[PDB]
Design a protein around this ligand. Structure first.
Ligand code: CHL
Ligand code: CHL
Ligand code: CLA
Ligand code: CLA
Ligand code: CLA
Ligand code: CLA
Ligand code: CLA
Ligand code: CLA
Ligand SMILES: CC1=C[C@H](O)CC(C)(C)[C@H]1/C=C/C(C)=C/C=C/C(C)=C/C=C/C=C(C)/C=C/C=C(C)/C=C/C1=C(C)C[C@H](O)CC1(C)C
Ligand SMILES: CC1=C[C@H](O)CC(C)(C)[C@H]1/C=C/C(C)=C/C=C/C(C)=C/C=C/C=C(C)/C=C/C=C(C)/C=C/C1=C(C)C[C@H](O)CC1(C)C
Lengths: 192, 203, 217, 165
C-alpha cells in the first residue's frame, strides 16, 4: 500500500497490498473482479509508459523549438522533419510502416497472457535482478506514469482552451500569474 | 425548557442536546435524526458564514461614514479592481475551499478521522472531536473552558440573528435600492414616516 | 397510506408488497394498465427513464432560460436552440442525429437486455473491463458502479427518501415539459416570459384569456 | 405538385366553382326582403360557403382539372409533401376509436361470461359494469399489446371445428 488517496477512508478488500501504486483509489469499484483487475493493471502500466513517451516527446519538440506537439502533423494535414532534418516520406507510407510495425510488436506482446514486467532484452542494463528495488522502481514507474497521463490530458485541455503550447502557456503563467490561468481563458469557467 | 411559544406542545425529538433547542419546528422538518444531523451542521455553517457576512457588511460601511482603500457599498464590491480579474480569484477560492470543505465533510462522515496535519504529521487536533465543533488550532486562545452549553447557545443565537440580518440586507437593499446603515439612519431620522408599510405604499 | 384521492378505492394491483415497495406509490391507476405484473415492471422502467430524461431536458430549458434573463449566458429560446446551434455547429443535423442514434442504440440495447434478464450484462468475457461493473444493484432501473459515482446509494436509511424525491421531481419535470410544449403553441413566448406575464398580471394573463385553450368562453 | 395536381389556392376551376356556388346562392337570395329569416338563412349559407372554401384553400389541398380536393393515401408521400392530415392522421384516429369499441365489447363479454346468466347480462345490459369498462377502455392499445405478449389474447385449439377440419 503506497498510501491513501483520501485519509480516513478505508482500503477496498479487493486491492492487494503487494501491488505497485495501491493507494486504494477505486470509487466506482471497477476492479472488484480479478480478471478485470488484471487487465486494468496491464492497461494502466501500458498507458503510463505511452504517456511518459508522449509527454517527453512534446516537451522535447517544444523546448528544442520546432513547433509544439500540435504543429507536428501540419505538413501532413496539408514536408516532414526530424531534428530539423527533412525526412523523405508521405502520410500513406508512414501509416503503412507504422501499422505493420505496431501490429507486429503489439501482436507479439498480446500473445503473452499476463506479462506486465517482461525483462530480458527489454531490460538490457539489468536493474530488475533484485526483486525489491525492482518493486520500488515499479512504484516509481506507476507514479511517473500517472503523472504523465495527467500531464498529457492537461496538454490537450490547455491547448483546446488557449490554442498555445504548454511551454508558452507556462511562460504566460510565469509572466502574468493572476492574469493568465484557466480563468482568463473564458472557456474553463463559462461565467464572467 | 424555554419555548419559542410558551404553553405550546413541542416536538418530542427536540431534547436540548442541540444548541439553541427551543422546540421550534412547525413544519416537522427534523423528524428523521439523519436529516436532523445534516440540518444541525448546515445551521452551524450558514450561521457562521452569515456572522462573517454581517461583520463584513457593517464594518466597512461603519468606517466609511467616519474618519480605507475604498468606501464602496457591499453590493458593489464586484466593480472594483483588486489587482486581478474576479474569475482568477473565483478559481483560487474554489481550489482552497475544495480542500477545506471536503476535509470538513470527511470529518462529518467519519468523526475522529480528520485530525492530524497531512504534511507535518506531528500536528494533530485532540480527541474531543464533536463534528461541527473542531477545537485545537481552531480554538487558539484557549476558550471553551466554559461548558460551551452557554457558548454554543450564544454562537447559535448570534448566528440566527445574523442569518436574519443578511436576509435583511438582501431584502432591504432590493427594496430601498440603497445601503443598510443609511436605511438605519433614515429610520432614526424619522421612524414614524419611514416604515416598511410607508415605503411599500410609497411605491 | 397516502393516495391521489382520499376515499377512492386503491386498485388491488397497486396494493401488494411488490407494488407498495416500489417508489411514489399513491394508488393512481384508474385505467388499470399495471394489472399485469410484467407490464408494471416494464412501466416502472419506462417511468424511470422518462423521469430522468425529462429532468435533464427541463433543466436544460430552465437554467439557460433563467440565466439568460440575468447578465451572462446569452442563450436562445428552447424552440430556437436547435437552429441556432446547427448554424453554430460543424455537422449537418442528419449526420448528428445518425451518430446519436448509433450511440444511444448501443446503450439502450444494454438497458433492454438488462430489463429482459437482470444478471445479463455481467458475462465474464463479453466486455473488456466494463463487465464487472455492469450488473444491477438488486433493484432494476437503479444500476450501480460507474452510474452513481459518489456512493450516495450506499446508506440504506436514506434510500427510499432518495427514490421518492427522484420520482416526484421526475413526474413534476414531465409536467413541466408538457407545459413547455403547450405554452409554446398557445402563447408564442418562452416559459420564463410566460412566468413574467403571470406575475405581472395574474388575473388577466392566463390560459382562460389566451384564446386557445378553451375557445367556447 | 403530386400527380400533376395543382394546389387548390392556385387552381382556377376551384375559384370558378366557388364563384358559381355564390352565384346560385345570390340568385336565390335576390327574391326576398333584408331582415327576413330566409334572407338571414341564405346569408349564413353564403358565409359558411366562403368559410369552407377559404379553409380548404388554407389546408393545402390539391385540386385537379375539376377544381375538387384530392386526397393522397401514401404515408411517405403524404409525410413528405405535408398531407398527413387527410388520410394518415384520420386512419390512426379511426383505429384508436375502433379498437376502443372492440376492446370495451370484449371486456364486457369476458366479464359477463363468468356468471350464472351470461345471456341475461347480454339481453339486459349491466350499466355500471358497462360504464366502468367504457371508462377503463382508454388504455386499450397498451392493454391489447400486453394481452398479446402474454398469450391470453388468443384462444387455443379448443375451438369448435367441423368434421373436415
Ligand atoms: C488521483 C486520484 C485521486 C483523487 C480523485 C483524490 C481525491 C481527493 N483527495 Mg487525494 N485523491 C487522489 C490521489 C491521492 N490523494 C493523495 C493524498 C491526499 C491527502 C493527504 C488528502 C487528499 C484529499 C483528497 C481530496 C482533495 C480535495 C481537493 O483538492 O479539492 C479541490 C476542489 C475541487 C472542487 C476538486 C474536488 C472535486 C479529494 C477528494 C484530502 C481529503 O479530502 O482527505 C480527507 C486530503 O487531506 N489526498 C495521495 C497520496 C497518498 C494520492 C495518490 O495519488
Ligand atoms: C455568494 C454571495 C454573493 C452575492 C449575494 C453576490 C451578489 C452580487 N454580485 Mg457577486 N455575489 C456574490 C458572490 C460573488 N460575486 C463575485 C464577483 C462579482 C462581480 C465581478 C460582479 C458581481 C456582481 C453581483 C451582483 C449580481 C447581480 C446581477 O445582475 O448579476 C448578473 C450578471 C452576471 C452574472 C454577469 C450582486 C450584487 C456584479 C455587480 O456588483 O454589479 C452591481 C458584478 O459586476 N459579483 C465573486 C467573485 C467570483 C463572488 C464569490 O463568491
Ligand atoms: C488510463 C487508464 C487507467 C487504467 C486502466 C487504470 C487502472 C487502475 N488504476 Mg489508475 N490512474 C490513472 C489511469 C488508469 N488507471 C490516472 C491517469 C491516474 C491519476 C489521476 C490514476 C490514479 C490511480 C490511483 C491513486 C490508483 C489507481 C488504481 C488503479 C487500479 C484499480 C482501479 C480500477 O479498478 O479501475 C480501472 C480504471 C479504469 C477502467 C480507468 C479507465 C478510464 C475510465 C473508464 C474513465 C476515466 C475518464 C476520466 C475520469 C476523464 C477525466 C477528464 C478530466 C477533465 C476530469 C487499476 C489497475 C488504484 C491502484 O491500486 O493502482 C494500481 C489506485 O490506488 N489509479
Ligand atoms: C499535471 C499537473 C498540471 C500542471 C503542473 C499544470 C500547469 C498549468 N496548467 Mg494545466 N491542466 C491539467 C494539469 C496540469 N496543469 C489538467 C489535468 C487539466 C484538465 C483539467 C489542465 C487544463 C488546463 C487548462 C484549460 C489551462 C491550464 C493552464 C495551466 C498553466 C497555468 C496554471 C493553471 O491555471 O493550471 C490549471 C489548474 C488545474 C487544472 C487544477 C489542478 C489540478 C491538478 C491536476 C492537480 C495536481 C497538481 C498537483 C497537486 C500540484 C502540481 C504538481 C506539479 C508541480 C507536477 C500551468 C502551466 C492554463 C494556461 O494555459 O495558462 C496560461 C489554462 O488555461 N491547464
Ligand atoms: C466570509 C465573509 C466575507 C467575504 C466573502 C468578504 C469579501 C470581501 N471583503 Mg470583507 N470583511 C469580512 C468578511 C468577508 N469579506 C470581515 C469579517 C471583515 C472585518 C474584519 C471584513 C472587512 C473588510 C474591509 C475593510 C474590506 C473588505 C473587502 C472585501 C472584498 C475584497 C476582499 C479582499 O480584497 O481580500 C483582502 C486581501 C487579502 C486578505 C490578501 C470582498 C468582496 C474590501 C471591500 O472593498 O469590500 C466591499 C474592503 O475594503 N472586507
Ligand atoms: C459570535 C458568536 C460566536 C460564539 C459565541 C461562538 C462560540 C464558539 N465557537 Mg464559534 N464561530 C463563530 C462565532 C461564534 N462562535 C463564527 C462567526 C465562525 C466562523 C469563523 C466560528 C467558527 C468556529 C470554529 C472553527 C470553532 C468554533 C468553536 C466555538 C466554541 C469555542 C470557541 C469560543 O469560545 O469562541 C467564542 C467566540 C467569541 C468570543 C467571538 C469573538 C468575536 C470576534 C472577536 C469578532 C471578530 C471581529 C469582527 C469581525 C469585527 C464556542 C462554542 C470551536 C469549537 O467548537 O471547539 C470545540 C471551533 O473549533 N467556532
Ligand atoms: C439532456 C438534455 C439536453 C439536451 C438534448 C440539450 C441540448 C442542447 N443544449 Mg443544453 N443543457 C442541458 C441539457 C440538454 N441540452 C442541461 C442539463 C444544462 C444545464 C447545465 C444545459 C445548459 C446549456 C447551455 C448553457 C447551452 C446549452 C445548449 C444546447 C444545444 C447545443 C448543445 C451542443 O451543441 O452540445 C455539444 C442543444 C440544443 C447551447 C445552446 O442552446 O446554444 C444554441 C447552450 O449555449 N445547454
Ligand atoms: C400499400 C402498399 C404501398 C404502395 C404501393 C406504396 C407506394 C409508394 N410508396 Mg409507400 N408506404 C407504405 C405503403 C405503400 N406505398 C406503407 C405501409 C409505409 C409505412 C411503412 C410507406 C412508407 C413510405 C415512405 C417513407 C416512402 C414511400 C414511398 C412510396 C412511393 C415509391 C416507393 C415504391 O415504389 O415502393 C413500392 C411500395 C411497396 C413495396 C410497399 C411497402 C412500402 C415500404 C415499407 C416503404 C417503401 C419506401 C421506399 C424504399 C422509398 C423509395 C424512395 C424513392 C425516392 C425511390 C410509392 C408511390 C416513397 C416516396 O415518397 O416516393 C415519392 C417514400 O419515400 N412509402
Ligand atoms: C483509476 C480509476 C478508478 C476508479 O474506479 C474510476 C475512475 C476514477 C474513473 C478511474 C480513473 C481513471 C482516469 C483518471 C483516467 C485518466 C486517464 C488518462 C488521462 C489517460 C491518458 C493517457 C494518455 C496517453 C497514453 C498519451 C499518449 C500520448 C502520446 C503517445 C503522444 C504522442 C504525440 C507526440 C509525442 C507529439 C506529436 O506531435 C503528436 C502526438 C501523436 C500527439
Ligand atoms: C400514470 C397513468 C396511469 C393511469 O392508469 C392512466 C393515465 C392517467 C393515462 C396515466 C397518466 C399518464 C400521463 C399523465 C403521462 C404523461 C407523461 C408525460 C407528461 C411525459 C413527458 C415526458 C417529457 C419528456 C420525456 C421530455 C424530455 C425533454 C427533453 C429531453 C428536452 C430536450 C431539449 C432541450 C433540453 C433543449 C433543446 O433546445 C430542445 C430539446 C431537444 C427539446
Amino acid at each position: 500500500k503506497a498510501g491513501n488517496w483520501l485519509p480516513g477512508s478505508d482500503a477496498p478488500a479487493w486491492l492487494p497490498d503487494d501491488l505497485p501504486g495501491n493507494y486504494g483509489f477505486d470509487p466506482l469499484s471497477l476492479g472488484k473482479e480479478p480478471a478485470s483487475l488484471k487487465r486494468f493493471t496491464e492497461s494502466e502500466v501500458i498507458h503510463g509508459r505511452w504517456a511518459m513517451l508522449g509527454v517527453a516527446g512534446s516537451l522535447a519538440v517544444e523546448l528544442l523549438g520546432y513547433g509544439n506537439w500540435y504543429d507536428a502533423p501540419l505538413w501532413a494535414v496539408n514536408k516532414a522533419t526530424w531534428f530539423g532534418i527533412e525526412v523523405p516520406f508521405d502520410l500513406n507510407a508512414l501509416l503503412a510502416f507504422e501499422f505493420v510495425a505496431m501490429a507486429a510488436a503489439e501482436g507479439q506482446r498480446g500473445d503473452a497472457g499476463g506479462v506486465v514486467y517482461p525483462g530480458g532484452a527489454f531490460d538490457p542494463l539489468g536493474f530488475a535482478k533484485d526483486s525489491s528495488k525492482s518493486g520500488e522502481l515499479k512504484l516509481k514507474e506507476i507514479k511517473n506514469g500517472r503523472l504523465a497521463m495527467v500531464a498529457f490530458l492537461g496538454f490537450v485541455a490547455q491547448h483546446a482552451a488557449t490554442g498555445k503550447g504548454p511551454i508558452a502557456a507556462l511562460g504566460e503563467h510565469l509572466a502574468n500569474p493572476w492574469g493568465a490561468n484557466f480563468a482568463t481563458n473564458g472557456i474553463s469557467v463559462p461565467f464572467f | 425548557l424555554p419555548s419559542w411559544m410558551p404553553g405550546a406542545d413541542l416536538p418530542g425529538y427536540l431534547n436540548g442536546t442541540l444548541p439553541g433547542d427551543f422546540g421550534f419546528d412547525p413544519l416537522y422538518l427534523g423528524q428523521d435524526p439523519v436529516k436532523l444531523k445534516w440540518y444541525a451542521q448546515a445551521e452551524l455553517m450558514n450561521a457562521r458564514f452569515a456572522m462573517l457576512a454581517v461583520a463584513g457588511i457593517l464594518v466597512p460601511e461603519l468606517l466609511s461614514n467616519i474618519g480605507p482603500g475604498a468606501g464602496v457599498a457591499w453590493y458593489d464590491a464586484g466593480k472594483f479592481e483588486y489587482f486581478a480579474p474576479a474569475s482568477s480569484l473565483f478559481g483560487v477560492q474554489m481550489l482552497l475551499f475544495a480542500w477545506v470543505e471536503i476535509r470538513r465533510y470527511q470529518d462529518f462522515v467519519k468523526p475522529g478521522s480528520a485530525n492530524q496535519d497531512p504534511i507535518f504529521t506531528n500536528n494533530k487536533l485532540p480527541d474531543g472531536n464533536e463534528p461541527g465543533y473542531p477545537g485545537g488550532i481552531f480554538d487558539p486562545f484557549g476558550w471553551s473552558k466554559g461548558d460551551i452549553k452557554s457558548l454554543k447557545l450564544k454562537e447559535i443565537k448570534n448566528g440566527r440573528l445574523a442569518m436574519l440580518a443578511f436576509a435583511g440586507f438582501i431584502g432591504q437593499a432590493y427594496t430601498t435600492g440603497t445601503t443598510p446603515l443609511k436605511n438605519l439612519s433614515t429610520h432614526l431620522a424619522d421612524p414614524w414616516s419611514t416604515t416598511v408599510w410607508q415605503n411599500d405604499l410609497a411605491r | 397510506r397516502q393516495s391521489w384521492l382520499p376515499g377512492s378505492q386503491i386498485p388491488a394491483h397497486l396494493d401488494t408488497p411488490a407494488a407498495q415497495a416500489l417508489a411514489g406509490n399513491f394508488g393512481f391507476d384508474p385505467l388499470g394498465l399495471g394489472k399485469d405484473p410484467v407490464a408494471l415492471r416494464w412501466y416502472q422502467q419506462a417511468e424511470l427513464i422518462h423521469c430522468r430524461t425529462a429532468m435533464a431536458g427541463v433543466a436544460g430549458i430552465l437554467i439557460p432560460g433563467l440565466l439568460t434573463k440575468a447578465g451572462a449566458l446569452n442563450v436562445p429560446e428552447w424552440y430556437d436552440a436547435g437552429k441556432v446551434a446547427i448554424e453554430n455547429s460543424f455537422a449537418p443535423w442528419g449526420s448528428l442525429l445518425a451518430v446519436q442514434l448509433f450511440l444511444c442504440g448501443f446503450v439502450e440495447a444494454k438497458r433492454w437486455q438488462d430489463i429482459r434478464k437482470p444478471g445479463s450484462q455481467g458475462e465474464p468475457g463479453s466486455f473488456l473491463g466494463f463487465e464487472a461493473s455492469l450488473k444491477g444493484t438488486s433493484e432494476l432501473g437503479y444500476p450501480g458502479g460507474p452510474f452513481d459515482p459518489l456512493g450516495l446509494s450506499k446508506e440504506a436509511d436514506k434510500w427510499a427518501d432518495w427514490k421518492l424525491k427522484e420520482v416526484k421531481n421526475g413526474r413534476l419535470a414531465m409536467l413541466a415539459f408538457l407545459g413547455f410544449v403547450a405554452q409554446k403553441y398557445a402563447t408564442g413566448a418562452g416559459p420564463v416570459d410566460n412566468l413574467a406575464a403571470h406575475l405581472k398580471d395574474p388575473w388577466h394573463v392566463n390560459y382562460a384569456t389566451n384564446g386557445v385553450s378553451l375557445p367556447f368562453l | 405538385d403530386i400527380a400533376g395536381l395543382t394546389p387548390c389556392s392556385e387552381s382556377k376551376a376551384y375559384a370558378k366553382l366557388e364563384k358559381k356556388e355564390l352565384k346560385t346562392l345570390e340568385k336565390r337570395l335576390k327574391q326576398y326582403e333584408a331582415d327576413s329569416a330566409p334572407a338571414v338563412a341564405l346569408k349564413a349559407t353564403m358565409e359558411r360557403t366562403k368559410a369552407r372554401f377559404a379553409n380548404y384553400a388554407k389546408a393545402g389541398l390539391l385540386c385537379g382539372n375539376d377544381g375538387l380536393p384530392h386526397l393522397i393515401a401514401d404515408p411517405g408521400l403524404a409525410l413528405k409533401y405535408g398531407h398527413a392530415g387527410e388520410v394518415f392522421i384520420p386512419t390512426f384516429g379511426f383505429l384508436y376509436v375502433a379498437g376502443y369499441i372492440g376492446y370495451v365489447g370484449r371486456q364486457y363479454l369476458i366479464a359477463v361470461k363468468g356468471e350464472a346468466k351470461p345471456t341475461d347480462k347480454e339481453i339486459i345490459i349491466d350499466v355500471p359494469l358497462a360504464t366502468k369498462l367504457a371508462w377503463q377502455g382508454a388504455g386499450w392499445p397498451l392493454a391489447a399489446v400486453q394481452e398479446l405478449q402474454r398469450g391470453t389474447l388468443l384462444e387455443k385449439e379448443e375451438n369448435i371445428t367441423v368434421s373436415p377440419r
